[PDB]
């Protein structure tokens, strides 16, 4: 799909922008938030946005696009007794700024949103509310998404995803041990390494791109694909992250009995300001005066300020959790 395409497009940029740092983000959370943005975008503003999300505007109509995310949100939000997973969309609109019925309707119908009256004049409290809605939805993992809030702010659209599922063959705490993790060939550090013995899991040694793919399921409809690139093969590997590579990998995995497997117990949390990257993907007009967001108010008097994103991943003996959230700070034009 376009989604996993957009996803790998962003990844590679996040990398160029900072080569040797751990990366962690949620693509779906970003696509749904910007897609949400489309409902107000018109003419060129809208065109740019859709194409930036790697959607093919000639095969897929605008309406086709929104109808999808609706259905996705529906199904995605199936947090039943087995694994937790929910996604939500909301928009805190400045107390006295009327939005066309259509927008307020399609937002609730297609993206499940709400319109909360926000007095942005009180940036201290406005930021508070929004931060507490995300903290709430993520069960307290994403604290302080909105770092700063402009005074001339008119509205902010936010999305968030919470996911909690135990493994399907847990690691036993008794087996975790301090071992070497090689930052590079002659550079190593000691870290808690989790284990598993005589394990039967999907496997694929990719000779072409020189890396081993392995699969570990969570209880329920979700799983973790791990790719261990060969020593010095990371650069090559990251270059080939194409929607076609992922399908080939998934389609090549066959069951194998592994003598022993080792995975590092860890927790990483990174946040970003996607302005630059989004501008490199082609989303430019929405950031200038030329921005057409007339679908929101009828008048063309809004423009994108910045788009930020925070994410957290915890990989423990019990699987644990991951969460991410995204917000689009819109200001007057």
């Amino acid at each position: 799909s376009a989604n996993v395409d957009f996803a790998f497009s962003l990844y590679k940029q996040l990398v160029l922008k900072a080569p040797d740092k751990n990366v962690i983000f949620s693509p779906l959370s970003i696509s749904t938030a910007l897609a949400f943005l489309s409902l107000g975008a018109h003419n060129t503003t809208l065109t740019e946005i859709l194409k930036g999300l790697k959607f093919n505007l000639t095969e897929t109509s605008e309406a086709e696009i929104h109808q999808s995310f609706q259905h996705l949100l529906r199904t995605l939000n199936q947090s039943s007794d087995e694994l937790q997973l929910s996604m939500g969309n909301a928009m805190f609109v400045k107390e006295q700024l009327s939005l066309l019925d259509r927008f307020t309707e399609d937002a609730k119908r297609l993206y499940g949103s709400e319109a909360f009256a926000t007095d942005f004049q009180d940036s201290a409290a406005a930021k508070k509310l929004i931060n507490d809605y995300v903290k709430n939805g993520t069960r307290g993992k994403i604290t302080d998404l909105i770092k700063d809030l402009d005074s001339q702010t008119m509205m902010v659209l936010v999305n968030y995803i919470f996911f909690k599922a135990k493994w399907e063959m847990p690691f036993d705490p008794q087996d975790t041990h301090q071992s070497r993790f090689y930052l590079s060939k002659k550079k190593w550090v000691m870290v808690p390494m989790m284990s598993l013995h005589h394990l039967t899991i999907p496997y694929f040694r990719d000779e072409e791109l020189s890396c081993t793919v392995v699969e570990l399921k969570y209880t329920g409809n979700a799983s973790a694909l791990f790719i261990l690139p060969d020593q010095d093969k990371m650069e090559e590997v990251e270059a080939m992250l194409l929607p076609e590579t992922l399908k080939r990998w998934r389609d090549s995995l066959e069951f194998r009995e592994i003598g022993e497997l080792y995975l590092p117990k860890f927790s990483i949390s990174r946040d970003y300001n996607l302005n630059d990257i989004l501008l490199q993907l082609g989303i430019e007009e929405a950031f200038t005066s030329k921005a057409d967001l007339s679908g929101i108010t009828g008048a063309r008097n809004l423009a994108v300020s910045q788009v930020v994103h925070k994410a957290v991943l915890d990989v423990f003996e019990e699987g644990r959790e991951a969460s991410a959230a995204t917000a689009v700070k819109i200001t007057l034009l």
Partner: protein, 33 residues
């Protein structure tokens, strides 16, 4: 028996079973931030 030892930089993608999208994309260069 084949051994899998994630003791150097690796990638990790959390994928649903049906609807092929990507929930979380990540790369671990050092387990300690």
């Amino acid at each position: 028996r084949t051994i899998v030892r994630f003791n150097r930089p690796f990638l990790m993608i959390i994928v649903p079973t049906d609807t092929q999208n990507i929930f979380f994309m990540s790369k671990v260069t050092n387990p300690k931030q």
